[PDB]
């Protein structure tokens, strides 16, 4: 089990931490452009890995975005987010996507440029 140069590994999933800034939808794209998808934290163990895999000053987008309608947080994998995992710090309005810091998960303006965080098997 493996992936190209510069791609950490925690269980059956690979992880490229992008390198340039791009609007959320853009990165979700960039991940696809490498048969992969924006991060989607399956469970606590996957979290307690990317988490302390981020050195202060480092962060990035993820498969969590607001919904516009119900106005909630959901994963690009198509499953509702749960307080059993974590809970974004910041407004929770439409037009807002998520990014992860080594400590917590904040909420940002999807129309903004940040580094991505792609995964896949």
């Amino acid at each position: 089990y493996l992936c190209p140069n510069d791609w950490l590994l925690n269980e059956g999933k690979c992880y490229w931490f992008s390198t340039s800034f791009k609007t959320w939808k853009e990165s979700q794209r960039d991940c696809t452009q490498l048969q992969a998808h924006l991060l989607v934290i399956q469970n606590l163990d996957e979290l307690e890995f990317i988490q302390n895999s981020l050195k202060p000053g480092h962060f990035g987008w993820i498969g969590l975005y607001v919904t516009f309608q119900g106005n909630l947080w959901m994963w690009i994998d198509e499953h509702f987010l749960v307080p059993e995992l974590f809970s974004v710090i910041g407004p929770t309005d439409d037009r807002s996507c998520a990014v992860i810091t080594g400590n917590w998960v904040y909420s940002e303006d999807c129309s903004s440029t940040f580094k991505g965080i792609c995964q896949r098997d």
């Binding site: 800034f21 000053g57 480092h58 407004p91």
Partner: protein, 117 residues
């Protein structure tokens, strides 16, 4: 005059580079508890240094825009614009790459600037 053993002396300024992370406001204060202001950059020579001594690591810089109003530093003064501020947020941060905008909630590093007497 010079700066202490934690601060870096660059021309007519003293800069402080953060080790742990904080939000934009939690930082604005910090520089103040050393009577400073989130590393506000003004010359073209300073810029290089900052990006250079920061690279892959993100830092806050005081520049901010109060709800659609207009980007303004920590001290007092409207920001002119010799450099872009991509992002579309209200708080600016510095990477060797460039400077982007954020909601200032994210806990990242920062830089403090304060006239070297």
């Amino acid at each position: 005059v010079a700066c202490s053993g934690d601060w870096l002396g660059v021309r007519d300024k003293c800069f402080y580079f953060s080790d742990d992370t904080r939000n934009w406001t939690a930082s604005k204060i910090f520089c103040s508890l050393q009577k400073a202001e989130l590393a506000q950059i003004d010359t073209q020579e300073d810029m290089e240094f900052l990006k250079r001594y920061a690279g892959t690591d993100m830092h806050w810089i005081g520049l901010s825009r109060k709800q659609g109003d207009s980007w303004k530093w920590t001290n007092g003064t409207t920001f002119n614009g010799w450099f872009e501020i991509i992002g579309n947020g209200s708080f600016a941060f510095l990477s060797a790459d460039g400077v982007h905008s954020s909601r200032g909630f994210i806990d990242i590093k920062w830089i403090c600037s304060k006239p070297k007497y």
